[PDB]
Design a protein around this ligand. Structure first.
Ligand code: ATP
Ligand code: ATP
Ligand code: ADP
Lengths: 219, 154, 298, 139, 356, 350, 101
């Protein structure tokens, strides 16, 4: 599967040619995350710490978690009412761990032909574990997270594979302790309990309604 | 193999290849369509090449390439030899039956035009005596080499 | 010269020689060359469909001065249709037999060719061969796939075989109204193919094929029982009376099953009862008899 | 040179590895259905004089059906064991390709193979992939 | 006979003796390709033919490795495939063809009734151009881009022209489909050319009309073999920020569909303010009737309130259509003026045929 | 013996001349061309090539050594702008059709009135309409009505079927639109009649493949040059399809087309003329009774009437006669008309 | 991990494509590697995606997956003899499949 440089006459392998791919995940690579100060967030400081306890200490103390006898998790879920910081939190924490943020929208996965999301998901998870200990964020997986065993038109065929090819990529067969997933929704019960259990996303981060004291802090 | 030689571009008013006292130039090659398209004759010209053959080279090349001493008196032992005299009889028989089929047929309405517009180049005497000649010469060479070694070896 | 192929030199690109005969690759499908396969009297019962076809094909050929004397033009377009396949090939092969005229059969599934353009170019290359022999008839077999409907292009209904249907409709009458060319199209399902070639500007004869009647079913039975071995004391009408809306081909199935029953007994004779169990084998339908499906609705 | 005719277009014969490897008497229980196919396929092949005498014209083909696991492929193997034809079998969903025209051309390649060759036997396993009733090709 | 490109000898007779021989053996033949990518400090350029293969070749010493970017038609050798002098697509004046800088024939009173958004367009356009004082003293950065959205023909083109004659300096209208080109990487060069040659002159206005075509539509979900709208869209969001350190020139977009919305555009620094247009209540309709009747021969004793009461939901293109249709009723007979009942039929003809 | 300099240049170029394709023209004695395999070359151009007719979209002559532009080539007999012009006259003027006089004043005021009497528009300053849509049930009166109005005109007329604009050379589509509208502009204010426009315009889908984009760009450039708004010179365009709901919406919206004429149903009034029109050019004997055929059958078009008269002519020639009797008409009425009679609620509604 | 020779892991969701016959080509390509190499295990996860029940007129996208499924039913157990090959299927919805599977 390698794109080696070949002589035009002898047909000799001499070059390596670093092997690019489709432009779509290239368009998904978002670098240069601006440093957002955590104090911009009001009233949600417990969830900030529980996130920093979840991800940053696995990034720093790589050998504290190995001699103790445990494994750091790799699945964190944010949920709550839409507009409470689902897109204000982890991209404020992606700004200090220098680990190459990589977004993933929900409805971009749904394409017109069949078997497009199964290519597009796997190649996105390919490129991250090709790289350094990167961070994959998925935004609105409520779109591709159906409530399965239901064969009803038209969302009965195109979603469940892309749902699965996600799921079999997360834990799957081989261990994927190279890249962390901080995927977030705004809805819980519409999900089917397939990836919804532990192993995958288990750190349930509820977002409460901002208080009077939280909103006055934010203003 | 061909060699060539460039003519100058100053002889544009005079015809190229200034031949004077020779008539061998019509020989040894004529300029083909794949040659006169690129540069002949307006850029370069062709030249004749002969082969410097002599003695002290030619007979010693033949006597070491196409020559065998021990091979000219072998016997090619008769497991496959008389076996080769059996696969050829059958196909010759079928050609003989096919030769039988045409000779008994004998179209005799406009024969000379029917014969010339309907040729096959395999029936009459093409496949009839070709293999027959080959089987005849082989056993003669084989038996004569068999008889000579019986005369020689005791 | 129109459609004149020439020999070109491959080095200087100069002319070499005017070439012989015109563009006709793959004429192995064309020019069937074998005249006897079947006679005329082995059809029976469908004589009206026979007389219409004979005097819509052989009459424009053998006496064109009659049609050139009234003032109207001669027909060239024939459509045959019958859903179970009754007289859809036999009537074709018979008229292909006693005509002394060139017969070209092309199934409507061959022109598809792998990449673009090639499947389109041989359309016109056929008709120029068809006009090359003016006494000729082209037969089309199962024009149902190529010729269905002009759908969208971005969604399904790929516009690749559509160009051939455009070419076929615009060749016979797009440029010049040709002559001595009769076409025959044979398929069922006359609700799913396209209707633009179904206007009376192109096809004049929509000859159908009804299921055979009891007199017709008797006549088909006498065809196939002619070569068998029959025992005396048998009625053939009552066999046809036990076929309520048969399909012509089912007469063969009854003849084979009655033959197969006499085979296992090692007997060259056949009874009336052999056919009675033969028809009852073939009459196996989902509209079961029950006496109550058809009597509650009287 | 001129190549011999039909040196191409598929290679789908069963001679000498691979074999079905089952005897005809292995299937216990089909006293009619084993007897029915054998009348239709093997019996025309040898005893052709019996059909011609009556004028039966032995049948061209045979549809088998029913629930799974009744003995369908197992019968076709023991047919293929005791036969002297070039047994040519094919998966149903095999000859459908990305490029148009490939499917129907492979249909022609199979039939010209078997017709030009010996009195062979063509076996298609499933056709419900490619043989339902037809409607308006919207796609 | 034929032509084969001939002429009478008076202009090419002196050309055809020795200049043809100097255009054969000295003058070479090059080809065009496309450039996929590049490398750093060393060329190692990857070039595709799209018909032959993808080649990894090097540039010649005739050009400098400065302007050779991804996606440029360059000259390719026949033997060594080396990169010769690249070729530009089109030259030169493609900016003046859309920048007429001409006084338009639009009265400021041609939009009446929805004056609230016109004052918003007064503040966003006119005040950072001529009153940049309160922006400095208080401490808010002035906005520099506003998207317009809503029902079609509501007055989008009308209000965008109302600011055009208001200052009369460098108005640039961009057709949304004009940037939809055929070549790979064609508009993104033009977007570079528009942005540089507009920043030379001050007090300039650029309008993007119908950004449903190129301004962030589906970003890349339907075009999976060409990728031109996206590359231009990625380029324009790239050249808008970064290459605008405290500019003066304003850029406005308008859309019909309120769906083609980039959150990266609503990042603060590109697009900040939401201004939509809505339907007239009563009087903004009647004003348009007063607009499209004064230019034609009508009766001076007819009213326009009653007509707008018959039209609950209507746009200015529809109101213009009624006047043309009621125009045609007066032409159907020999009437040289327009009577009220011809307007009444034209209401019933336009509305009660397909709308409701 | 006098012609020398032209003879040398007839001999200067290479002999196996190939045929090229103009793509872009740069005025520095070299440009970019295209071969037949889509391979493109940075070649040059000579001086004798008569640089006046070099248009991107024209054909040229190329070489094998350097492949430079040997000479410009003509259109090589491509009559795609001249054949569609109707030279002769169409069918009968207004007495051919019957019972469509509701729709006649619409097209007469839209076409004849802007040309013959352009004073009603100038009395009030009101512009004429540009486009007219003719839709309705298929084969109703649409082609017959367009020939009826085009017969009564005093300007040139165009007949476009719509399939003769679609080619695959990636430029030929929108070029012939510009080449026709240049012919219509330079010549008299012709009547553009592009029939079957639903094959080119519907629902505006954009795919990634290269089979559909050759339609959309030709459609888009058509709407561009229809509304070019530079100098059109009052060119009247008549567009017609059968259905209307699966069409392009921006061609429907005003500013483009403001005339959407429908062609409704029939009756037993308009039929009797078409029976008389189709039974005029034949040896109609004095023993035929068409009135019994008219009253009996109650749903048929003129294309049905034509199919009756032809089958009546065929039945008379099968029995080896010249004239036609009534019986040939009776059987033709009973034979041909039995192909579509299906679906009626009889005796339910008085 | 233990007693492994040749272990294939199929996700059974990525084996669909936009082209009509390509998924069946993948399956036979998977099984010929299984005959290339002796004893081998084919693990297909989640049969619920590509399995399911046959039914009537069914939105032509679904016709492909039934053809992909019919290819799988034939190749692993059909006319030929699958030898030294074992198959581990694993899912969560065994309720509605093909009963022929
Ligand atoms: N009148 C008849 N006499 C004898 N046999 C008949 C008759 N009608 C039908 N058959 C039998 O029916 C079978 C079908 O042939 P036919 O031409 O009628 O339809 P077909 O062409 O096979 O249908 P399709 O066009 O669907 O293939 C033939 O084997 C034929 O023997
Ligand atoms: N009568 C029988 N005698 C012996 N074995 C049988 C019998 N019937 C079924 N079997 C066993 O059951 C299996 C039946 O499967 P077979 O390969 O015949 O196709 P099927 O399962 O019947 O049809 P399909 O594969 O289409 O579902 C055989 O492998 C065979 O081992
Ligand atoms: N804790 C917070 N403090 C300040 N602003 C917040 C907070 N949570 C959300 N926001 C604001 O919400 C806006 C976007 O809401 P967001 O979380 O993106 O909604 P969603 O993620 O559901 O689309 C941001 O502009 C941000 O300023």
């Amino acid at each position: 599967g390698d794109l080696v440089g070949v002589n035009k006459d002898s047909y000799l392998i001499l070059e390596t040619l670093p092997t690019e791919y489709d432009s779509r995940v290239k368009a998904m690579e978002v670098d240069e995350r601006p440093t957002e100060q955590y104090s911009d967030i009001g009233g949600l400081d417990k969830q900030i710490q529980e996130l920093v306890e979840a991800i940053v200490l696995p990034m720093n103390h790589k050998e504290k978690f190995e001699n103790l006898g445990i494994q750091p998790p790799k699945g964190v879920l944010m949920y709550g009412p839409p507009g409470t910081g689902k897109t204000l939190l982890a991209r404020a924490c992606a700004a200090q761990t220098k680990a190459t943020f990589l977004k993933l929208a929900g409805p971009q996965l749904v394409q017109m032909f069949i078997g497009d999301g199964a290519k597009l998901v796997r190649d996105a998870f390919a490129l991250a574990k090709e790289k350094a200990p990167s961070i994959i964020f998925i935004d609105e997986l409520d779109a591709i997270g159906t409530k399965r065993f239901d064969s009803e038109k038209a969302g009965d065929r195109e979603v469940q594979r892309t749902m699965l090819e996600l799921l079999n990529q997360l834990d799957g067969f081989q261990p994927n302790t190279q890249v962390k997933v901080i995927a977030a929704t705004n809805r819980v019960d519409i999900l089917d309990p397939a990836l919804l259990r532990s192993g995958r996303l288990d750190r349930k981060i509820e977002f409460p309604m901002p208080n009077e004291e939280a909103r006055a802090r934010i203003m | 193999i061909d060699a060539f030689r460039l003519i100058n571009a100053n002889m544009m008013v005079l015809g190229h290849e200034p031949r004077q006292t020779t008539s061998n130039l019509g020989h040894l090659n004529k300029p083909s369509i794949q040659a006169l398209i690129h540069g002949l004759n307006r850029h370069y010209y062709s030249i004749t090449i002969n082969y410097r053959k002599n003695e002290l080279e030619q007979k010693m090349l033949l006597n070491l390439h196409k020559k065998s001493w021990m091979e000219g008196l072998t016997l090619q032992d008769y497991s496959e030899h008389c076996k080769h005299n059996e696969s050829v009889v059958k196909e010759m028989l079928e050609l003989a039956k096919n030769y039988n089929k045409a000779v008994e047929e004998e179209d005799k309405m406009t024969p000379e035009q029917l014969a010339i517009k309907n040729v096959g180049k395999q029936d009459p005497k093409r496949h009839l005596e070709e293999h027959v000649d080959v089987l005849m010469t082989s056993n003669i060479v084989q038996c004569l080499a068999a008889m000579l070694d019986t005369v020689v070896f005791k | 010269t129109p459609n004149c192929r020439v020999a070109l030199r491959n080095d200087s690109y100069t002319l070499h020689k005017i070439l012989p005969n015109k563009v006709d690759p793959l004429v192995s499908l064309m020019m069937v060359e074998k005249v006897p396969d079947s006679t005329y009297e082995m059809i029976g019962g469908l004589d009206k469909q026979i007389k219409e076809i004979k005097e819509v094909i052989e009459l424009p050929v053998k006496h064109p001065e009659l049609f050139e004397a009234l003032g109207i033009a001669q027909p060239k377009g024939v459509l045959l249709y019958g859903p179970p396949g009754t007289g859809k090939t036999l009537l074709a092969r018979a008229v292909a037999h006693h005509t002394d005229c060139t017969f070209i059969r092309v199934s409507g599934s061959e022109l598809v060719q792998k990449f673009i353009g090639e499947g389109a170019r041989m359309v016109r290359e056929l008709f120029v061969m068809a006009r090359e022999h003016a006494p000729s008839i082209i037969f089309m077999d199962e024009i149902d796939s190529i010729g269905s409907s002009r759908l969208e292009g971005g969604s399904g209904g790929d516009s690749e075989v559509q160009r051939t249907m455009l070419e076929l409709l615009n060749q016979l009458d797009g440029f010049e109204a040709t002559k001595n060319i009769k076409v025959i199209m044979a398929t069922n399902r006359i609700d799913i193919l396209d209707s633009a070639l179904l206007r009376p500007g192109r096809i004049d004869r929509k000859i159908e094929f009804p299921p055979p009647n009891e007199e017709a079913r008797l006549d088909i039975l006498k065809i196939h029982s002619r070569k068998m071995n029959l025992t005396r004391g048998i009625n053939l009408r009552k066999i046809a009376e036990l076929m309520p809306g048969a399909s012509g081909a089912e007469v063969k199935g009854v003849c084979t099953e009655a033959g197969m029953y006499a085979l296992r007994e090692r007997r060259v004779h056949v009874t009336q009862e052999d056919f009675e169990m033969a028809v009852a084998k073939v009459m196996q339908k989902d509209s079961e008899k029950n006496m109550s499906i058809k009597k509650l609705w009287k | 040179d001129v190549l011999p005719p039909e040196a191409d277009s598929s290679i789908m014969m069963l001679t000498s590895d691979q074999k079905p490897d089952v005897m005809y008497a292995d299937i216990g229980g089909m006293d009619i259905q084993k007897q029915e196919v054998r009348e239709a396929v093997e019996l025309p092949l040898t005893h052709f004089e019996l059909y011609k005498q009556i004028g039966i014209d032995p049948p061209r083909g045979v549809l088998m059906y029913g629930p799974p696991g009744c003995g369908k492929t197992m019968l076709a193997k023991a047919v293929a064991h005791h036969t002297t034809a070039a047994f040519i079998r094919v998966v149903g969903s095999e000859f459908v390709q990305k490029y148009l025209g490939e499917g129907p051309r492979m249909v022609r390649d199979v039939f010209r193979l078997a017709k030009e060759n010996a009195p062979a036997i063509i076996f298609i396993d499933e056709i419900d992939a490619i043989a339902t009733k037809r409607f308006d090709a919207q796609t | 006979e034929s032509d084969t490109g001939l002429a009478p000898p008076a202009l090419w007779d002196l050309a055809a003796d020795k200049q043809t021989l100097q255009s054969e053996q000295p003058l070479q033949v090059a080809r065009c390709t496309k450039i996929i990518n590049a490398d750093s400090e060393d060329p190692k350029y990857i070039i595709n033919v799209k018909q032959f293969a993808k080649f990894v070749v090097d540039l010649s010493d005739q050009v400098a490795p400065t302007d050779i970017e991804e996606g440029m038609r360059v000259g390719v050798d026949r033997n060594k495939y080396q990169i010769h002098i690249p070729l530009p697509p089109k030259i030169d004046p493609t900016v003046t063809m859309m920048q007429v800088e001409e006084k338009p024939d639009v009265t400021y009173s041609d939009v009446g009734g929805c004056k609230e958004q016109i004052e918003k367009l007064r503040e966003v356009v006119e005040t950072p151009l001529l009153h940049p004082e309160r922006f400095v003293n208080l401490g808010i950065e002035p906005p520099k881009g506003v998207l317009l959205f809503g029902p079609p023909g509501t007055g989008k083109t009308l209000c965008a022209r109302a600011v055009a004659n208001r200052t009369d300096a460098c108005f640039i209208r961009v057709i949304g489909s004009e940037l939809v080109q055929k070549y790979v990487g064609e508009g993104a060069r033009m977007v570079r050319e528009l942005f540089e040659m507009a920043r030379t002159k001050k007090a300039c206005l650029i309008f993007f009309d119908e950004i449903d075509a190129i301004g962030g539509a589906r970003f890349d979900d339907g075009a999976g073999g060409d990728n031109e709208v996206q590359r231009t869209m990625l380029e324009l969001i790239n050249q808008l920020d970064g290459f605008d350190p405290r500019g003066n020139i304003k850029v406005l977009m308008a859309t019909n569909r309120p769906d083609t919305l980039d959150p990266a555009l609503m990042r603060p620094g590109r697009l900040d303010r939401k201004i939509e247009f809505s339907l007239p209540d009563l009087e903004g309709r009647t004003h348009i009737f007063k607009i499209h009747a004064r230019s034609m021969s009508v009766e001076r004793d007819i009213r326009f309130e009653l007509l707008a009461r018959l039209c609950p939901n209507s746009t200015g293109a529809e109101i213009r259509s009624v006047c043309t249709e009621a125009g045609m009723f007066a032409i159907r007979a020999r009437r040289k003026i327009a009577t009220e009942k011809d307007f009444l039929e034209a209401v019933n003809k336009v509305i009660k045929s397909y709308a409701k | 013996k006098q012609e020398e300099e032209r003879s040398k240049v007839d001999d200067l170029r290479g002999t196996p001349m190939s045929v090229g394709t103009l793509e872009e023209i740069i005025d520095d004695n070299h440009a970019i061309v295209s071969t037949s395999v889509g391979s493109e070359h940075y070649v040059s151009i000579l001086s004798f090539v008569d640089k006046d007719l070099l248009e991107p979209g024209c054909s040229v002559l190329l070489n094998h050594k350097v492949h430079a532009v040997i000479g410009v080539l003509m259109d090589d007999t491509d009559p795609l702008v001249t054949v569609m012009k109707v030279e002769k006259a169409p069918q009968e003027t207004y007495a051919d059709i019957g019972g469509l006089d509701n729709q006649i004043q619409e097209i007469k005021e839209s076409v004849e009135l802007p040309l013959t009497h352009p004073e009603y528009y100038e009395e009030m300053g009101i512009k004429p309409p540009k486009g007219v849509i003719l839709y309705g049930p298929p084969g109703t009166g649409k082609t017959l009505l367009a020939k009826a109005v085009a017969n009564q005109t005093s300007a040139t007329f165009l007949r476009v079927v719509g399939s003769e604009l679609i080619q695959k050379y990636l430029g030929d589509g929108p070029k012939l639109v510009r080449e026709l509208f240049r012919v219509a502009e330079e010549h008299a204010p012709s009547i553009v009649f592009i029939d079957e426009i639903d094959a080119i315009g519907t629902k505006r889908y954009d795919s990634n493949s290269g089979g559909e984009r050759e339609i959309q760009r030709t459609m888009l450039e058509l709407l561009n040059q229809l509304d070019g708004f530079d100098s059109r010179g009052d060119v009247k365009v008549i567009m017609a399809t059968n259905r209307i709901e699966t069409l392009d919406p921006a061609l429907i919206r005003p500013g483009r087309i403001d005339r959407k004429i429908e062609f409704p149903l029939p009756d037993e009034k308009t039929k009797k003329r078409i029976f008389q029109i189709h039974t005029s050019r034949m040896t109609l004997a004095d023993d035929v009774t068409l009135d019994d055929l008219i009253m009996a059958k109650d749903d048929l078009s003129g294309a049905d009437i034509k199919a009756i008269c032809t089958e009546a002519g065929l039945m008379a020639l099968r029995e080896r006669r010249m004239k036609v009797t009534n019986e040939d008409f009776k059987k033709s009425k009973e034979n041909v008309l039995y192909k579509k009679q299906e679906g009626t609620p009889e005796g339910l509604y008085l | 991990s233990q007693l492994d020779c040749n272990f294939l892991k199929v996700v059974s969701s990525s084996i669909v494509d936009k082209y009509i016959g390509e998924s069946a080509r993948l399956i036979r390509e998977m099984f010929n590697y299984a005959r290339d190499h002796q004893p081998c295990i084919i693990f297909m996860d989640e049969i619920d995606a590509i399995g399911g029940r046959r039914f009537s007129e069914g939105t032509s996208a679904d016709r492909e997956i039934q053809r992909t499924l019919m290819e799988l039913l034939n190749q692993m157990d059909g006319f030929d003899t699958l030898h030294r090959v074992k198959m581990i299927m694993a899912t969560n919805r065994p309720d509605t499949l093909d009963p022929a599977l």
